[PDB]
Every structure is written in C-alpha cells, then in structure tokens.
Amino acid sequence: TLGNTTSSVILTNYMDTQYYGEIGIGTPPQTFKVVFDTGSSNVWVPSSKCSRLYTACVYHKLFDASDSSSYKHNGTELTLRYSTGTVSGFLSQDIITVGGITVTQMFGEVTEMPALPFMLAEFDGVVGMGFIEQAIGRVTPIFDNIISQGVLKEDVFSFYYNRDSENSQSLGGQIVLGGSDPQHYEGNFHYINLIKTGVWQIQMKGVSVGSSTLLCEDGCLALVDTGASYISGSTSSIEKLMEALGAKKRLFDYVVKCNEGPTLPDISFHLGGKEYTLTSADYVFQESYSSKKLCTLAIHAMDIPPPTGPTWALGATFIRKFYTEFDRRNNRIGFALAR
Numbered sequence: 001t002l003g004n005t006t007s008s009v010i011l012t013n014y015m016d017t018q019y020y021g022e023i024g025i026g027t028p029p030q031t032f033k034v035v036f037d038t039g040s041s042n043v044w045v046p047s048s049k050c051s052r053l054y055t056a057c058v059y060h061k062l063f064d065a066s067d068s069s070s071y072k073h074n075g076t077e078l079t080l081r082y083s084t085g086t087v088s089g090f091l092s093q094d095i096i097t098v099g100g101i102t103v104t105q106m107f108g109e110v111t112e113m114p115a116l117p118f119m120l121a122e123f124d125g126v127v128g129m130g131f132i133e134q135a136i137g138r139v140t141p142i143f144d145n146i147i148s149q150g151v152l153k154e155d156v157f158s159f160y161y162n163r164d165s166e167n168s169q170s171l172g173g174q175i176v177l178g179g180s181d182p183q184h185y186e187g188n189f190h191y192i193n194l195i196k197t198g199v200w201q202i203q204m205k206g207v208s209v210g211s212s213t214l215l216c217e218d219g220c221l222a223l224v225d226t227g228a229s230y231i232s233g234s235t236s237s238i239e240k241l242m243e244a245l246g247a248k249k250r251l252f253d254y255v256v257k258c259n260e261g262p263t264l265p266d267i268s269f270h271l272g273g274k275e276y277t278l279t280s281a282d283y284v285f286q287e288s289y290s291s292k293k294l295c296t297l298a299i300h301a302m303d304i305p306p307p308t309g310p311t312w313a314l315g316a317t318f319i320r321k322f323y324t325e326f327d328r329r330n331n332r333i334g335f336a337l338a339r
C-alpha cells in the first residue's frame with residue numbers, strides 16, 4: 001500500500017567517516033544517535049542493562065525499559081556478528097520515531113559492547129536498512145514495518161552524504177524515506193538491478209585505476225553500504241589497487257605522502273551502463289600537502305565472508321560523490337551526481 005508521505009531525517013557528518021541521525025524510543029522518548037545502515041537489517045541501541053565494565057556503555061546513551069510505558073518485553077538473546085566486531089544482547093519492543101513516522105518496532109537492547117570499535121563510535125546504535133532475509137533472529141526490519149503502514153509515496157529510501165565542512169550551517173547528510181530529494185542530486189538516476197532480493201548488492205563489471213591498471217576484469221560484486229566509511233575490496237584486490245597508487249600499508253589503513261595525494265589517478269567503477277569515477281580529491285583525506293606528512297585513503301581491504309562476500313563494498317566514500325536511491329519495489333539501486 002502507498003500513501004503520499006515523504007519523511008526526511010537530517011544526518012550529522014562526523015569526520016567523513018560516520019553519518020548518523022536521531023530516533024526516539026519509548027514513552028516518553030529516549031533519543032539515540034543511529035547509523036542508517038544498508039549493510040545490516042537489525043535495529044539496536046545500547047541497553048541500561050549493559051555492564052559498566054563495557055566502557056563503550058559508559059560513553060553512550062542507554063535504553064532504559066523501566067522508564068518507558070509503551071515497552072513490551074521479549075528477552076530473546078541476540079548476537080550480531082559484524083565485519084568490525086560483535087554486539088550482543090536481547091530483543092525488546094517499543095515505539096520508535098524516525099523523522100515523524102512512528103512505528104512499533106522489535107529491536108535489540110545491547111548488553112555487550114566492545115571498546116574496540118564502539119569507543120570510536122559517535123553514534124549510539126544502528127538502524128538496519130537491509131532486507132528481512134539478513135535479519136538476525138528473523139526480526140522484521142524497521143523499513144518493512146513502515147511499508148506496512150502504507151503512508152509512503154514510494155517503497156524507496158535515499159541517502160545524501162555531504163563532504164565534511166567545519167561550518168555549522170552545513171548539512172551533514174539526509175535520508176529520505178519514501179522518495180528522493182532533487183535538491184541533493186543533479187542529472188538523472190541510472191539504475192542497476194540487485195543480483196537478488198535480500199541484499200543491497202549489485203553486479204560490478206570492472207574497476208579501473210587510471211589508464212594502465214585493471215581489476216574486477218571478469219566481473220565482481222558491489223555491496224552498497226551506507227554504514228561503511230570507506231570503499232572496500234578483498235585483500236588481494238586492494239593489494240593490486242594500492243600498488244598502482246604507490247600507497248603504503250599500515251595496521252588498519254593505507255597512506256600516501258600528502259604531497260603525492262593530488263597526483264593519484266582516477267578510480268572508476270563500472271556499474272550497469274555507467275562508469276562511476278572518483279578523483280584523488282574524492283578518495284584522499286587531503287589533511288595537508290606536506291612531503292613530511294602521510295595522508296590516509298578512504299579505501300581499505302575487507303574480506304567479507306560468504307554468502308554476501310567475497311565482495312567490494314561502496315561506502316560513504318562512494319555515496320558522497322553519488323546520491324543513492326534504494327528501491328525496494330523494483331529491487332534496484334539508483335545513482336545520480338550529488339550536489
């Protein structure tokens with residue numbers, strides 16, 4: 001069922017690596033900073049029942065069911081094993097407010113929150129924008145529940161991720177539920193169908209580094225991940241890519257001498273009928289131009305395990321350049337040049 005509602009949530013851009021917006025849980029609402037994540041399908045926030053020996057719980061907002069009159073107990077154990085770490089807790093139900101839409105939602109109350117990486121998190125929790133097929137504990141995802149209300153103009157949601165400005169007047173980003181915002185893209189959308197329903201993953205035809213270097217020559221996969229900071233490939237693909245850039249591997253990232261940064265070649269991703277090109281300005285964190293300083297790249301290696309992986313992941317690095325529309329009705333992803 002389709003209505004006429006379009007609901008927009010303003011996002012905060014933290015250092016070009018974390019984009020989060022606000023949701024309200026319970027009666028009266030308890031507010032949380034959440035990542036709207038196409039690479040996961042569960043809603044979770046830290047719990048009041050999280051042992052304060054998990055220091056990430058001391059530094060985050062915690063959900064207290066004892067202060068909510070609309071809370072409905074569940075208690076089923078929940079373990080969410082992600083690429084960056086694991087969170088664990090139990091299932092709870094309450095009313096969630098997201099941009100003006102109110103939905104009764106089953107979510108995870110996290111009681112085990114590792115300091116690595118969650119002490120680096122500016123957000124409190126996660127809003128999974130993925131399909132029910134990838135939902136842990138077969139919990140109905142928030143977007144499915146919003147669709148059931150039949151209030152949205154379209155069975156779509158869109159993401160705009162801005163470049164990190166130090167100006168407060170700068171909008172960090174924006175998620176539109178039910179449509180797209182023409183104020184944040186130009187030209188037209190070019191759609192690529194999903195390999196299969198259940199994953200925000202498409203076929204990638206090839207990856208070009210300048211003129212001479214070529215990767216994904218026989219085709220590969222691309223997961224379009226709003227909850228990933230960087231563009232990611234397999235360890236092997238990233239080794240060849242970084243060799244072509246003249247980048248040096250560190251513990252968790254890849255760097256170049258800052259002065260060399262503006263000289264790096266364009267990287268192009270062949271998706272559907274179009275080539276999606278990122279210049280060095282798009283993937284280099286140009287913090288300086290010093291020959292005496294190292295500059296990080298917004299590209300890393302991430303070996304995603306099956307059935308989803310092996311796959312590339314197009315994270316915030318990609319979405320900043322290309323406004324993205326996630327189309328549930330048609331099982332496709334649309335890209336347009338962001339503005």
Ligand SMILES: CC(C)[C@]1(C)CC(=O)N(Cc2cccc(C(=O)NCc3ccccc3)c2)C(=N)N1
Nearest residue numbers: 017018019035039040082083084226227228229
């Ligand atoms: C948000 C995140 C914790 C999680 C739930 C779990 C996870 O491993 N990924 C992939 C993944 C891979 C590599 C890095 C990161 C990262 O640094 N994300 C931070 C972030 C937060 C908000 C927006 C963009 C990026 C995430 C997700 N898609 N969702």
Ligand SMILES: *[C@@H]1O[C@H](CO)[C@@H](O)[C@H](O)[C@H]1NC(C)=O
Nearest residue numbers: 072073074075076091106138
């Ligand atoms: C938790 O929710 C699921 C939803 O299908 C339900 O089947 C289960 O019985 C619930 N558990 C409890 C103890 O309420």
